[PDB]
Ligand binder design. Structure first.
Ligand code: HEC
Ligand code: HEC
Ligand code: HEC
Ligand code: HEC
Ligand code: HEC
Ligand code: HEC
Ligand code: HEC
Ligand code: HEC
Ligand code: HEC
Ligand code: HEC
Ligand code: HEC
Ligand SMILES: O=C(O)CN(CC(=O)O)CC(=O)O
Ligand SMILES: O=C(O)CN(CC(=O)O)CC(=O)O
Ligand SMILES: O=C(O)CN(CC(=O)O)CC(=O)O
Ligand SMILES: O=C(O)CN(CC(=O)O)CC(=O)O
Ligand SMILES: [Ca+2]
Ligand SMILES: [Fe+3]
Ligand SMILES: [Fe+3]
Ligand SMILES: [Fe+3]
Ligand SMILES: [Fe+3]
Ligand SMILES: [Mg+2]
Ligand SMILES: [Mg+2]
Ligand SMILES: [O]
Ligand SMILES: [O]
Length: 800
């Protein structure tokens, strides 16, 4: 075999478990990546950790099925550190309806607490070499001799599935010589290995977490952000689960460490605890807020972390983390079954049994169901719930018990949790439509196009259709340009874009609709512009005469319809029922003088990649809430500013770039918060945007932003034609296209004149007077295109 001092990689497998009079040993088969046995561990002077944990999977019971939970045999009661036992605080946030400031309160329950843990300190003392690269670890901890801990049943039970975990790290290695392994087994059947269906998994790193998280553990770059915890040494889910048990808490706050409770609260932006070395980790951002507003001496800028997690899906999007397609963990359906801490971790944010001790007692003549039970059964309200508007007590009283208490194979609360997502899918499928190409008679000012609609009840005849926008945008074959803001026009107030609501034919004097069974042919008139040096409505649509048409249909759905065999679509004017909107996009059709295709804009990012984090078909109307958000997109300022809706759907086909391009109209922003699509999206996700319109909180991007493959596919960054695009004209000056693309991270201001000179040396312009750059001048591609001398794929920590 090979000496560990010379091994560049380690792998480790666990086997041959023995437990005898409470004495636990296990074999660690140590190899290199190539499978060569690695010798010399037991004497190696560069070992950072050898940590071995052991746990049993214990059953739970109550009404319905409850999933089994892990109990570590190794635990201890931690005292709180008094100086780091967090005080309660309050902070201002918004205003009530009368215009007075709302105060919010954050409350903690410091006090001693149990923490599960592993055996860490023994290391090589506990090892005996049994073979080449085979080391027997014999725990120092005896199962017969565990100190009693009040409330915990530590009794050894061979009939229960057990787990042992290993964390092994040498040479300070982030990856190559880091291992997390585990083995699950049934001691009472001769310590055989557990079947997938016998043990507890629930989530799987690959099926459930990597859609957002980097696992590039060896990432050496400055912006590295891999999902490795506790100094870098813990990376495997199975390892977390042995410490992060239902009964473990942080003594300094009272916060739960239970895996589900902690993970739900982190991604909801409510979790706060004090960790190693007394560092406070506040995932809400509110601690720093209160410090700045009121004073909060326990928050120490630069040491404690107080940042609001910005999750790119709703916290209600369970399928982001829990598999429903039977390609995840075999016990993925665990998320359908009630578990106090899990249910509480969203619905009871900020509540605890001290500050809300009333809930410890059920109402006169009701059964006591515990703190969380009583909340769900008795005390919850829409005003106080961790999910505003949710009415659990209404479900308890009116929805029957099976709404939350599920037998195996039933849906429980998933019936409610998945209802809008499921109906949304069905409705998109049922109302799917196609836009055929438009014929634009430009002298006549008239656009004709046919929609292939799902039925012979047309959009304007279907009261379940809220609106049906079709937007057309001029495209000159090179790149979209929004252009100056004109005076208002009948159809819109943009040079390059018109949005028309087809659901309102009868009241629109410019629109006529002619049904032919399921096909509806529309004719839009009044598309006329005097073409001059002046900005006028439809100026580009008229001078270019061709471009693309995109559909955004809004269907009203019934939030009270929970049964997927029923029709979830509902009359938009209905008053009984809470209604939500389902968005249905379309193909991107062309319009042109004869309705022939307009060659597609180049695709330079991947739709499926933005969906990894944002979910499929993410809507960004709410991103348009700052400025003139209530103006409709067929009406003056709303043409560009609307959030009701924003009229774009797809992310990677240029629909956003129709506006977000090199030529923002007016009230322009400077480069460091620029409007142009690549520049805006780079800056948001790299945290180089000087100001975000709708929040003071930087995005918490869960990948490395310098991992270009997070959004770009291999081949999309040749940069071959990029220099032929028009410059981005920001408030102060213009930036050539490759310069804008790169400087959106590398130079959002002229702070390093060397980097700015590099641009200018090689045909680029940076914050130059308008008109300076000539398309074709940038020579960037020759060195920075993928695969070149300094190719973007070579200089950046990419993971294709
Ligand atoms: C066209 C105007 C461009 C633009 C926009 C950029 N380059 Fe280059 N580049 C080259 C070399 C050898 C380096 C140094 C590499 C290293 O030190 O590891 C660079 C550097 C850059 C950067 C990074 C700057 C920073 O420190 O932030 C950026 C953003 C960049 N370049 C952009 C090589 C070349 C060329 C070789 C002939 C060509 C041509 C270009 N670069 C052109 C451009
Ligand atoms: C969600 C809105 C619920 C509804 C509807 C019902 N129950 Fe429930 N119950 C719920 C929670 C979140 C808890 C706490 C579980 C925990 O681990 O703390 C409970 C608790 C109970 C219990 C205790 C036993 C258990 O299964 O944990 C019982 C016996 C119980 N609830 C009964 C019950 C009945 C009879 C219901 C219909 C009348 C009912 N629950 C509805 C959540 C919800
Ligand atoms: C996008 C929808 C995500 C999915 C799916 C998962 N996580 Fe996540 N996580 C996400 C964000 C935006 C953040 C904050 C930014 C960051 O990466 O730090 C997090 C954070 C965490 C953390 C805290 C990391 C740290 O700051 O200490 C943990 C421990 C974590 N996420 C775990 C986790 C697990 C186990 C997931 C699969 C079940 C998972 N995340 C999915 C976004 C997203
Ligand atoms: C026991 C050896 C642990 C294993 C394995 C993992 N975690 Fe852990 N974690 C553990 C404890 C006892 C604590 C609280 C410490 C305290 O001072 O009270 C934590 C804390 C966290 C946190 C909060 C942030 C922090 O303190 O760094 C997170 C986000 C967390 N743990 C995540 C986590 C993950 C995802 C793990 C598997 C890869 C994991 N931990 C393993 C104990 C242990
Ligand atoms: C990633 C950020 C998550 C999203 C979004 C949701 N869940 Fe989750 N959940 C997540 C993890 C990592 C865990 C812990 C797994 C473990 O080892 O303990 C859970 C757990 C739950 C549970 C408990 C399951 C059990 O212990 O058997 C429940 C009941 C649960 N989750 C429900 C749930 C719902 C309904 C969600 C959408 C509204 C949801 N989770 C989102 C990670 C994440
Ligand atoms: C965050 C990850 C959640 C966890 C964990 C649990 N719930 Fe939940 N719940 C969540 C959201 C975002 C919503 C609203 C869903 C919607 O479409 O708007 C809900 C809703 C419910 C409901 C229905 C409430 C109502 O219609 O008024 C119930 C009955 C419910 N949740 C119960 C419940 C149970 C019992 C949980 C543990 C299994 C649980 N939730 C966890 C978010 C999250
Ligand atoms: C996970 C690694 C992501 C990938 C891949 C993509 N996005 Fe993203 N985005 C992510 C986070 C954590 C956030 C912060 C969310 C918040 O609520 O603040 C964002 C934000 C955006 C935004 C801004 C939304 C807003 O400020 O109104 C946009 C427009 C956006 N993301 C778009 C987008 C596109 C087009 C992507 C593929 C090219 C893409 N994102 C990928 C996380 C991640
Ligand atoms: C013109 C009809 C637009 C299209 C199509 C899209 N956006 Fe937009 N966006 C537009 C304007 C006029 C504004 C200014 C602010 C306002 O409230 O009107 C914006 C702004 C954004 C932002 C702001 C981000 C920030 O500055 O930090 C985001 C995140 C955003 N837009 C995203 C976005 C996406 C993802 C689009 C395609 C789905 C999209 N916009 C299209 C005008 C228009
Ligand atoms: C598209 C042709 C536009 C129409 C019509 C109107 N506005 Fe606009 N506005 C537009 C853009 C692209 C931007 C952002 C510029 C950038 O470089 O980021 C704006 C900005 C504003 C602002 C500043 C606040 C902001 O969100 O940046 C205001 C106050 C504003 N716009 C107002 C406004 C009014 C009153 C309009 C009708 C009279 C109007 N806009 C139309 C693009 C377009
Ligand atoms: C998602 C959060 C992204 C990350 C990570 C990176 N880029 Fe990107 N890029 C992103 C968007 C949404 C766009 C505009 C897409 C469109 O349809 O126009 C871009 C564009 C580019 C470009 C211009 C490519 C071209 O038009 O020929 C370049 C040169 C570019 N991006 C470079 C790049 C690099 C080197 C990255 C890793 C360090 C990288 N991007 C990350 C979104 C995202
Ligand atoms: C944010 C999404 C980025 C964009 C877009 C581009 N780059 Fe980048 N780059 C970024 C980071 C965070 C780093 C540091 C990575 C590290 O290893 O620590 C880099 C690095 C470079 C380098 C290496 C030389 C250096 O100056 O560090 C080069 C040569 C480089 N980047 C080039 C470059 C070009 C030409 C871009 C436009 C096509 C570009 N980058 C975009 C982040 C981001
Ligand atoms: O396909 C589904 O059933 C669910 N969708 C929505 C959609 O396709 O409209 C997201 C997804 O596939 O994860
Ligand atoms: O459903 C499809 O056929 C393809 N998808 C993504 C996917 O599910 O992988 C795009 C979408 O549904 O919008
Ligand atoms: O286009 C305009 O309306 C003129 N501008 C440019 C800009 O809005 O950034 C400033 C102005 O109103 O005089
Ligand atoms: O452009 C507008 O319509 C309003 N203005 C000033 C103005 O030019 O009158 C503020 C702004 O654009 O930020
Ligand atoms: Ca602590
Ligand atoms: Fe889908
Ligand atoms: Fe799909
Ligand atoms: Fe102006
Ligand atoms: Fe103005
Ligand atoms: Mg009409
Ligand atoms: Mg707006
Ligand atoms: O899908
Ligand atoms: O403006």
């Amino acid at each position: 075999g090979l000496d560990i001092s010379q091994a560049t990689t380690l792998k480790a497998t666990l086997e041959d478990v023995k437990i005898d009079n409470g004495t636990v040993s296990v074999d660690i088969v140590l190899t290199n990546a190539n499978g060569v046995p690695v010798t010399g561990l037991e004497q190696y002077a560069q070992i950072n950790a050898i940590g071995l944990g052991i746990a049993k999977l214990t059953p739970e019971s109550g009404k319905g099925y409850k999933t089994p939970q892990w109990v570590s045999y190794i635990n201890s009661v931690k005292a709180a550190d008094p100086a780091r036992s967090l005080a309660n605080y309050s902070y201002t946030d918004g205003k009530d309806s009368a215009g007075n400031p709302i105060t919010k309160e954050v409350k903690f329950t410091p006090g001693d607490a149990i923490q599960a843990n592993i055996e860490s300190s023994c290391k090589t003392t506990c090892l005996t070499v049994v073979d080449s690269g085979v080391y027997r670890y014999t725990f120092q901890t005896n199962l017969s001799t565990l100190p009693a801990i009040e409330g915990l049943d530590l009794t050894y039970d061979p009939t229960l599935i057990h787990r042992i975990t290993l964390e092994l790290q040498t040479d300070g290695s982030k990856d190559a010589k880091l291992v997390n392994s585990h083995i699950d087994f049934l001691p009472s059947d001769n310590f055989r290995v557990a079947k997938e269906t016998e043990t507890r998994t629930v989530v799987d790193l690959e099926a459930n977490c990597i859609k957002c998280h980097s696992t590039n553990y060896s990432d050496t770059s400055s912006t590295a952000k891999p999902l490795a915890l506790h100094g870098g040494r813990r990376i495997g889910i199975a390892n977390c689960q042995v410490c992060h048990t239902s009964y473990s808490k942080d003594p300094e706050t009272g916060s739960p460490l239970d895996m589900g409770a902690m993970v739900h609260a982190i991604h909801k932006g409510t979790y706060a605890m004090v960790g190693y070395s007394g560092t406070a980790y506040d995932f809400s951002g509110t601690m720093a807020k209160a410090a700045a507003e009121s004073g909060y001496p326990q928050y120490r800028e630069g040491k404690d972390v107080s940042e609001r997690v910005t999750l790119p899906v709703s916290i209600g999007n369970c399928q982001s983390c829990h598999s429903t397609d039977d390609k995840g963990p075999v016990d993925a359906a665990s998320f359908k079954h009630h578990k106090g801490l899990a249910c509480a971790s969203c619905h009871m944010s900020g509540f605890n049994p001290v500050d809300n001790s009333e809930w410890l007692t059920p109402p006169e003549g009701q059964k006591d169901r515990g703190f969380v039970g009583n909340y769900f059964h008795y005390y919850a309200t829409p005003e106080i719930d961790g999910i505003p508007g949710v009415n659990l007590v209404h479900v308890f009283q009116n929805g029957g018990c099976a709404s939350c208490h599920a037998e195996q194979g039933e849906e429980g609360s998933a019936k409610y949790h998945l209802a809008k997502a499921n109906a949304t899918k069905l409705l998109r499928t049922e109302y799917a439509y196609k836009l055929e190409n438009g014929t634009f008679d430009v002298a006549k000012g008239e656009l004709t196009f046919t929609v292939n609609w799902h039925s012979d009840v047309a959009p304007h005849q279907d009261p379940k259709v809220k609106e049906f926008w079709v937007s057309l945008t001029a495209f000159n074959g090179t790149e979209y340009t929004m252009g100056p803001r004109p005076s208002n026009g009948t159809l819109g107030r943009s040079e390059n874009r018109i949005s028309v609501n087809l659901a309102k034919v009868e009241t629109n004097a410019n629109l006529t609709a002619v049904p032919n069974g399921s096909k509806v042919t529309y004719t839009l008139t009044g598309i006329k512009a005097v073409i001059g040096t002046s900005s006028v409505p439809y100026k580009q649509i008229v001078s270019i005469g061709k471009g693309f048409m995109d559909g955004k249909l809004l269907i009203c759905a019934n939030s009270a319809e929970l049964d997927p065999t029923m029709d979830a679509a509902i009359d938009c004017s209905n008053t009984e029922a809470p209604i939500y909107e389902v968005i249905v996009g379309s193909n991107k059709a062309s319009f042109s003088a004869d309705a022939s295709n307009v060659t597609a804009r180049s695709i330079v990012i991947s739709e499926a990649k933005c969906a990894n984090c944002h979910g499929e078909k993410a809507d960004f109307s709410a991103s348009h809430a700052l400025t003139h958000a209530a103006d409709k997109p067929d009406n003056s300022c709303g043409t560009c500013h609307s959030a009701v809706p924003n009229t774009a759907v797809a992310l990677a086909d240029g629909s956003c770039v129709a506006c977000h391009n090199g030529a923002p109209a007016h009230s322009k922003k400077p480069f460091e918060r620029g409007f142009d699509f690549k520049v805006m999206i780079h800056q948001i996700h790299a945290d180089t945007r000087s100001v975000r319109r709708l929040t003071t909180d930087a995005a918490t991007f869960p990948e490395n932003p310098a991992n270009c493959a997070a959004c770009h596919d291999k081949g999309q960054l040749s940069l071959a034609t990029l220099g032929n695009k028009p410059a981005f004209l920001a408030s102060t000056g213009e930036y050539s296209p490759t310069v804008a693309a790169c400087a959106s991270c590398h130079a959002t201001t002229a702070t390093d004149s060397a980097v700015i000179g590099h641009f200018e040396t090689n045909g680029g312009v940076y914050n130059a007077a308008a008109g300076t750059y000539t398309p074709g001048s940038e020579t960037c591609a020759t060195c920075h295109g993928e695969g070149k001398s300094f190719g973007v794929d070579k200089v950046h920590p990419v993971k294709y």
